[PDB]
Amino acid sequence: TEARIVFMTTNYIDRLDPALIRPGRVDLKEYVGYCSHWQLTQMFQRFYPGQAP
Amino acid sequence: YIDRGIPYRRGYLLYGPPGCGKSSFITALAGELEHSICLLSLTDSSLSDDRLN
Amino acid sequence: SLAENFAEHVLKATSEISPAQVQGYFMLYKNDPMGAVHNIESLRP
Amino acid sequence: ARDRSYAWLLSWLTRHSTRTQHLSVETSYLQHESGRISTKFEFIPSPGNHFIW
Numbered sequence: 001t002e003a004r005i006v007f008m009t010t011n012y013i014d015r016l017d018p019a020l021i022r023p024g025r026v027d028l029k030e031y032v033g034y035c036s037h038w039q040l041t042q043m044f045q046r047f048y049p050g051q052a053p
Numbered sequence: 054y055i056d057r058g059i060p061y062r063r064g065y066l067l068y069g070p071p072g073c074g075k076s077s078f079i080t081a082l083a084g085e086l087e088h089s090i091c092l093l094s095l096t097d098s099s100l101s102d103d104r105l106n
Numbered sequence: 107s108l109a110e111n112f113a114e115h116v117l118k119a120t121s122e123i124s125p126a127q128v129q130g131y132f133m134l135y136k137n138d139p140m141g142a143v144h145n146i147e148s149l150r151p
Numbered sequence: 152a153r154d155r156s157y158a159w160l161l162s163w164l165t166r167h168s169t170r171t172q173h174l175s176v177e178t179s180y181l182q183h184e185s186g187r188i189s190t191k192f193e194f195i196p197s198p199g200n201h202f203i204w
């Protein structure tokens with residue numbers, strides 16, 4: 001059916017058959033990985049609002 | 054077909070790597086021929102040989 | 107000529123491109139033919 | 152209810168029912184030509200005795 005958005009998540013992308021994730025079954029694949037310097041900075045600023053940068 | 058005794062049936066097979074346009078072409082062909090599509094799932098649980106016939 | 111250029115560049119970059127991948131690539135660059143003809147290299151495996 | 156005639160006749164009863172006021176609801180999703188889908192409120196004559204001309 002048309003007008004449908006499907007979100008799927010996994011921790012082991014290597015276990016997904018390439019036919020399951022193909023351009024027309026999954027139109028966008030994004031990697032949500034570990035923290036980075038900017039990510040840690042933003043997390044600290046959000047958890048302790050008011051402190052100096 | 055009738056004048057030669059051949060059964061009046063035909064079957065087609067589309068094969069290839071995934072995402073190259075088999076299902077889309079079948080839908081387009083059904084639209085062009087003004088036919089309908091009867092989706093049959095062979096690997097069902099209620100499907101038997103007599104029921105398939 | 108743009109279509110021929112795009113096809114030649116895609117065939118030079120990747121060797122086995124499925125029509126679904128091409129459709130997705132066009133989905134990225136909506137109403138921007140020049141962007142599609144420019145960013146072929148993103149299709150490299 | 153074991154015949155496709157039942158389906159066709161039920162559909163025809165839904166369509167041609169004059170101004171019958173003993174209906175029952177049937178919710179379905181109707182895809183508009185604009186590309187989106189909206190709820191369709193369809194009324195089928197509820198069980199009872201109905202009269203046509």
Ligand SMILES: Nc1ncnc2c1ncn2[C@@H]1O[C@H](COP(=O)(O)OP(=O)(O)OP(=O)(O)O)[C@@H](O)[C@H]1O
Nearest residue numbers: 023024070071072073074075076077078125126129
């Ligand atoms: N030749 C083609 N022309 C246009 N669009 C195509 C073509 N091949 C694939 N697509 C597009 O790719 C997507 C999925 O394609 P399709 O379902 O036909 O693939 P397939 O090879 O039949 O795979 P599957 O058997 O898993 O369904 C759709 O968005 C469809 O429009």
Ligand SMILES: [Mg+2]
Nearest residue numbers: 072075076077
């Ligand atoms: Mg298919």
